[PDB]
Design a protein around this nucleic acid. Structure first.
Ligand SMILES: [Mg+2]
Ligand SMILES: [Mg+2]
Ligand SMILES: [Mg+2]
Ligand SMILES: [Mg+2]
Ligand SMILES: [Mg+2]
Ligand SMILES: [Mg+2]
Ligand SMILES: [Mg+2]
Ligand SMILES: [Mg+2]
Ligand SMILES: [Mg+2]
Ligand SMILES: [Mg+2]
Ligand SMILES: [Mg+2]
Lengths: 159, 51, 222, 172, 58, 185
RNA sequence: GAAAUUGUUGAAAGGGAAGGGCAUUUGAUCAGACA
RNA sequence: GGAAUACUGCCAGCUGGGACUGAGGACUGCGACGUAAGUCAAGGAUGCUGGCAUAAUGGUUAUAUGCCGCCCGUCUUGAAA
RNA sequence: AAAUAUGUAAGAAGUCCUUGUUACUUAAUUGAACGUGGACAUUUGAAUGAAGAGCUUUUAGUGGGCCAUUUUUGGUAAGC
């Protein structure tokens, strides 16, 4: 009959990259994780212990526990019409520091600097991002750039 | 009790926008533009008539 | 009985001062409208005389009209239409042109016809079909008092100031535009001009981006 | 697709820091109005250069008017069109007074004789034949005869009323 | 008398009538499943700082 | 054709008038409806809304609860307002000299308050003394202490009480409750 | 002393069914105010 | 070299004919025209005039005419069957 | 190695300075977690919208489906 094992349909998901087999680089075991850190999950095929399920591949969670060689991750999973809270025990080979919020730490640092610099000069520091506004007016010079006339080409085979 | 449309009822048109009286008095809807005598460059007209 | 002429005289005096402010402001807006349009025309003449080309700035304001009914609509286009307050056919709403709003327009492209409104179209829409959202109620814009009472903190004190914030996208465009109830237009008096509406304007239908041609369509529906 | 006007459309790629002031490209477009002309510009530019609307801009669009709208001219047109199976090249000659009034005749003839719609026709070139005997289509040469003269037999007159009280005549 | 086996038709429409609710976030989340050794010393740290705060406002 | 974003003709979901037919209670509603309309004081609106509650939403407030509320810093000389019945508590042995206004006082609660030197007044007298609810304090009883609440949300690993008639050794302690019999909850 | 059903008298319509909805013509019949 | 006109757009430019509607019921508001008193098309129709005062309008009912209308109840994905 | 769908973040439950607790941890007042006090208000951290948000108890009916565009399996095909 039908088969729904733990690692079913994971033929290509858990493979290693091309010419990227073998041992794990040492920098994986030297990074430090704390409670509240935001990390994303990517299973490693060389390590069969503490490997997450195929559902959580490519999902981002928040660290809530630290252990000897593993951490706890909280992920919200949609079940039916609501979301449930999931807790996973994954070793450090399967996770890394997500950069989704890392960029946000620079803007808040930059917002504090910009506000302080303009505090003694002018109000309305404009500490909000804006979308790509429509282009303004401009003048296009034809000096050495006279337009070239183009026409559709006929049909040919060249086979 | 009953909404009245400006531009069809002059009194309501004068209730809001009091400047409407000045606009009609000076005939600002038919203002003449200042004359200019600029001519396009030879590059523009040659490109316009270019095949 | 007291306070029968004292407060009436004071209240009428206050009304006259407000009338003078509106009179002076509308004069200023008229001057800047005329000056801006003449400069653009003059710039084009100067560029041609110099052997160059004057590229006008891209438009910042669009007016979107829903031209289809409420049946057989896929979910994602349906949700976007609700976010633009287009719940019935022939409804209109001004949208500020940004990078985020352009992607919204592409999704609901088959169901709406939008373009670039002019000052004349905006003025006639507000005067004839201008309704405000006050305490979740649709209140006709029949006097300047209601505009002052709901938009005074944003510097708007007249119906022409409301029009000014629309034609020229100001810092308070979001609050002014959200104040206006979505416009309820009728069918065009001269028709749509095409045998089948539900084709792109380029191919010969109704929906799409018809740019300045929207002004002819809106006036027929208004 | 409607009454035709001739628009000059000049476009350009968006300037970058590596190559500011890029080249300008121009092409004549026959279109009903201004909206269609700009759309057709990107349709033909996407078949020639690595550029599209998102990464490009329209520099200037201008309408082209005939220098001599009231002089009879002989026009030769080269077209590329798609049939129900394959693509064919074609050369036809049209006698008229203006380019806009000669392109509309071409679209009527293509739809009538080959069932080709607007979407499957490309106008390669429209040119005016200046010298006689360069015309190679007999249906045009017959109108170039010295002192052209032909009658109009069998005239039919429209009637405004349902009934007529005399037998009509087709004299002219 | 064979019949239909399985389908996901109309399932997501029912789920969107009242569902798809983001879970509530609470300050001080539950400490279930955390390291027992960490929890033991954390209890004494909270007990110690309570005495220190009370001693300052005796 | 309107593409509704929400349900139409939906009722608010809150009580507007009391469900009871008590003539004296409706008099209090009429009195505080006038106050809540022409006094713009948040106390009046709270009292008017509280007059519509049902019996389970108006738990009794004991005298011990009143005494504990009077031990707050600076609240020893406030008028305690309880929209409901005030019951007597024999666990407490001392009682202050406060002023309490409530719908009903039990035969024991009224005696204890008066003997301590205080007074028991009705809600209509409070409007005379405190039209805007000055120096007032509203107390409410516990709702989740009700017997029916402990059976709500029954399910596996919830720790809720089961709906059972007879409690004993042979009543819902077998398989499904302990590891020795199949499994535990 | 009801209905199904039937006789007589009176009125009406009817070219392979009858009955019904909207509007009005025709025939018969009828209430309301004359302040 | 100097004009005209076509096409497109704007006017808080003027003006003629037709159709449907008259809701509300002391005053209160925002305005306009006036030195003023006042007036006004300004928070919803008034003025003038004629015929008839009854089966004339109208109601009910029968018939005729234009268009439309398949037999209800039920099981069913689906019933005039 | 696409297109379309898909996880997370876009602040007050935040950022920064200083120092209190512990039986955990460190060669070590080293670190971890939790705190006292001080500083920065709502262009307070993109867009749009919001007949308001959140929560609870109880119960009916249903648990034979079918059609169309598109993706797609078996079969020569089917109103399969
Ligand atoms: Mg093992
Ligand atoms: Mg369709
Ligand atoms: Mg017509
Ligand atoms: Mg049509
Ligand atoms: Mg089934
Ligand atoms: Mg009988
Ligand atoms: Mg009659
Ligand atoms: Mg009939
Ligand atoms: Mg029929
Ligand atoms: Mg059957
Ligand atoms: Mg049936």
């Amino acid at each position: 009959g039908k088969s729904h094992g733990y690692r079913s349909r994971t033929r290509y998901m858990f493979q290693r990259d091309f010419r990227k087999h073998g041992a794990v680089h040492l920098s994986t075991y030297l990074k430090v994780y704390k409670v509240g850190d935001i990390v994303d999950i990517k299973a490693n095929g060389s390590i069969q212990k503490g490997m997450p399920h195929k559902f959580y591949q490519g999902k981002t969670g928040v660290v809530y526990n630290v252990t000897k060689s593993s951490v706890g991750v909280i992920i919200n999973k949609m079940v039916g019409n609501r979301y449930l809270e999931k807790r996973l025990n994954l070793r450090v080979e399967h996770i890394k520091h997500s950069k989704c919020r890392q960029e946000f730490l620079e803007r808040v640092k930059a917002n504090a600097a910009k506000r302080a610099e303009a505090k003694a000069q002018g109000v309305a520091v404009q500490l909000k991002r804006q979308p790509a506004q429509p282009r303004e007016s401009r003048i296009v010079s034809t000096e050495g750039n006279v337009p070239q006339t183009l026409a559709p080409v006929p049909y040919e085979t060249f086979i | 009790v009953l909404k009245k449309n400006p531009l069809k009822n002059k009194q309501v048109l004068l209730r809001l926008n009091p400047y409407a009286k000045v606009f009609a008095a000076e005939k600002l809807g038919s203002k003449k533009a200042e004359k200019t005598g600029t001519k396009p460059a030879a590059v523009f007209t040659e490109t316009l008539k270019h095949d | 009985a007291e306070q029968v002429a004292a407060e009436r005289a004071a209240r009428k005096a206050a009304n006259k001062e407000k009338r003078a402010i509106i009179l002076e402001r509308n004069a200023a807006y008229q001057k800047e409208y005329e000056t801006a349009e003449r400069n653009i025309i003059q710039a084009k003449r100067d560029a041609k005389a110099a052997g160059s080309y004057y590229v006008e700035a891209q438009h910042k304001l669009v007016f979107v009209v829903r031209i289809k009914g409420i049946n057989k609509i896929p979910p994602k286009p349906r949700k976007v239409l609700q976010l633009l307050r287009l719940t019935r056919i022939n409804s209109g709403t001004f949208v500020k042109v940004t990078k985020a709003t352009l992607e919204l327009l592409k999704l609901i492209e088959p169901y709406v016809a939008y373009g670039y409104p002019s000052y004349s179209t905006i003025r006639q829409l507000v005067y004839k079909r201008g309704f405000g959202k006050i305490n979740k109620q649709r209140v006709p814009l029949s006097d300047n008092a209601i505009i002052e009472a709901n938009l005074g903190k944003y510097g708007i004190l007249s119906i022409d100031d409301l029009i000014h914030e629309i034609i020229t996208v100001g810092p308070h465009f979001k609050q002014a535009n959200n104040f206006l109830w979505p416009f309820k237009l009728s069918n065009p008096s001269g028709g749509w001009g095409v045998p089948r509406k539900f084709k792109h304007f380029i191919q010969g239908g109704s929906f799409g981006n018809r740019e300045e041609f929207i002004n002819k369509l809106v006036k027929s529906m208004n | 697709m409607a009454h035709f006007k001739e628009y000059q459309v000049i476009g350009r790629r968006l300037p970058t820091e590596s190559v500011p002031e890029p080249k300008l490209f121009r092409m004549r477009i026959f279109a009903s109005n201004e909206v269609i002309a700009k759309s057709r510009y990107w349709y033909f530019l996407q078949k020639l250069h690595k550029v599209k609307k998102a990464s490009g801009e329209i520099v200037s669009i201008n309408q082209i008017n005939e220098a001599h709208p009231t002089k009879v001219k002989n026009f030769g047109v080269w077209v590329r069109y798609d049939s129900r199976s394959g693509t064919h090249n074609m050369y036809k000659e049209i006698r008229d007074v203006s380019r806009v009034a000669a392109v509309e005749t071409l679209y009527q003839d293509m739809a009538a004789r080959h069932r080709a719609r607007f979407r499957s026709i490309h106008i390669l070139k429209v040119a005016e034949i200046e010298k006689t005997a360069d015309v190679k289509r007999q249906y045009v040469k017959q109108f170039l005869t010295k002192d052209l003269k032909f009658p109009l037999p069998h005239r039919v007159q429209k009637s405004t009323k349902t009934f007529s009280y005399k037998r009509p005549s087709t004299f002219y | 008398a064979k019949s239909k086996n399985h389908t996901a038709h109309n399932q997501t429409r029912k789920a969107h009538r009242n569902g798809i609710k983001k879970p509530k976030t609470y300050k001080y989340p539950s400490l279930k499943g955390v390291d027992p050794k960490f929890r033991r010393n954390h209890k004494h740290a909270l007990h110690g700082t309570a005495k220190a705060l009370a001693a300052a406002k005796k | 054709g309107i593409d509704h974003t929400s349900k139409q003709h939906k009722r608010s979901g809150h009580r507007t008038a009391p469900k009871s037919d008590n003539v004296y209670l409706k008099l209090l509603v009429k009195l505080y409806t006038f106050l809540a309309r022409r006094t713009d004081a948040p106390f009046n609106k709270v009292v008017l809304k509280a007059l519509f509650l049902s019996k389970i939403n108006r738990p009794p407030v004991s005298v011990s609860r009143i005494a504990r509320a009077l031990k707050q810093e600076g609240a020893a000389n406030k008028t305690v307002v309880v929209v409901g019945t005030v019951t007597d508590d024999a666990r407490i042995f001392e009682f202050p000299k406060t002023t309490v206004a409530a719908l009903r006082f039990t035969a024991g609660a009224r005696a204890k308050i008066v003997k301590a030197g205080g007074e028991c007044i009705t809600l209509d007298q409070l409007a005379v003394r405190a039209p805007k609810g000055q120096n007032t304090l509203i107390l409410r009883g516990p709702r989740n202490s009700r017997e029916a609440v402990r059976h709500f949300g029954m399910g596996p690993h919830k720790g809720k009480a089961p709906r059972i008639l007879s409690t004993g050794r042979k009543f819902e302690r077998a398989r499904g409750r302990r590891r020795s019999k199949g499994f535990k909850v």
